[PDB]
Design a protein around this ligand. Sequence first.
Ligand SMILES: *[C@H]1O[C@H](CO)[C@@H](O)[C@H](O)[C@H]1NC(C)=O
Length: 304
Amino acid sequence: DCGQPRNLPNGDFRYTTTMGVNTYKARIQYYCHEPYYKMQTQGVYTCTAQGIWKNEQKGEKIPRCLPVCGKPVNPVEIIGGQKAKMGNFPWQVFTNIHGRGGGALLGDRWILTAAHTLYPKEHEAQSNASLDVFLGHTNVEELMKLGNHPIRRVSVHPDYRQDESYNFEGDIALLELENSVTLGPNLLPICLPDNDTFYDLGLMGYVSGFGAHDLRFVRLPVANPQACENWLDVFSQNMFCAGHPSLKQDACQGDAGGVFAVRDPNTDRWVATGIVSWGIGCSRGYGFYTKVLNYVDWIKKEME
Ligand SMILES: *[C@H]1O[C@H](CO)[C@@H](O)[C@H](O)[C@H]1NC(C)=O
């Protein structure tokens, strides 16, 4: 006689044998909660004669449920600078550390964001400063009504430098929420890039952000690193330019630590390819973002 099958968070299990009898020969089946989670690919265990539940492949250890990244229940389709509707950008995070910021949800309990966001901007005075993070809506007062999410710890890329006044490398950070969130149709994860070909000229992505009450967005193309010249050019190996002389002041729709979201057509997902950085004014219609892919192996090792 075995015991009470171990629990499987974000998932459960059913008995395929008389139910409630964990005696020798019993047999159960695990299943992650649909549709927001999915087993790590059928999760069948059976009380061996010895006295433990097993699975002829990884036996003795319970499967793992994960969430589905970049795949909202409300996507959207030239170029523009319009308003956002509940669902379009589900992985969107609005912060309020040292001023208004942004960030993208990763997985179940981590938020991606640019590092310079966590520190006051120079020429600004030092101060107490709670870290406020919100998600699950497009309006500001609403995101507030919902309340903020307590942060457990804060990991900032080791390359970033505070005394350096121009960080064209390592302007990325990860915040670990203290309690996972409640994945709804309005609040869901975004995927990470893996193909170097995600940073190709002309590629069309979307940027979203507040200004300032209702979250807006823009559909801009990846530009040539030359376009972003006044901001300084080895700024190519750690970042990328993007925008168009047409957009005007809307090329800077993003907030800061917000995200540059592209949608892979071969798999119709959604991947965060960049992080709006420390720039300040899209006068010509251009702006630079940090290359996320250069930091993927980092992101993952932090999330374990
Ligand atoms: C700033 O520190 C905390 C921030 O939450 C606040 O409670 C406090 O009143 C401020 N500093 C003081 C002691 O005035």
